């Protein structure tokens, strides 16, 4: 869920607030998406979006109204290092995978606040 997503982005960027640094940034960084990722960061929100399309495929997302930003899956942030538990089952695993991937993407990428809060035209 949301709540854990901003987490595991902290757990990666200690100064950040993930919920404003990371929210209507670019052409996906936001709820839903379009056009063409405009820099590295867009396109880690890119995948992240294609990858909650991806788990709401899963027959095991499909059974539980399991929705990815209010479902919620157990993980834990050790040295600013992220990891999934072996307790999640099927759809919350896959989904906090979506995020930590994402978390981890988003800490290695350039952050060009041009880009934030970005006119849609460009999308
Ligand atoms: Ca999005
Ligand atoms: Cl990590």
């Not at 896959?94 to 350039?110: Q, T």
Request: proline content about 4%; some cysteine; hydrophobic content about 25%.
């Amino acid at each position: 869920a949301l709540w854990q997503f901003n987490g595991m982005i902290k757990c990666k960027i200690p100064s950040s607030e993930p919920l404003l640094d990371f929210n209507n940034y670019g052409c996906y960084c936001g709820l839903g998406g379009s056009g063409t990722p405009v820099d590295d960061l867009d396109r880690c929100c890119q995948t992240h979006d294609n990858c909650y399309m991806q788990a709401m495929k899963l027959d095991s997302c499909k059974v539980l109204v399991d929705n990815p930003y209010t479902n919620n899956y157990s993980y834990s942030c050790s040295n600013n290092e992220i990891t999934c538990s072996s307790e999640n089952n099927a759809c919350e695993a896959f989904i906090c995978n979506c995020d930590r991937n994402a978390a981890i993407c988003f800490s290695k990428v350039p952050y060009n606040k041009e880009h934030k809060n970005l006119d849609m035209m460009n999308c």
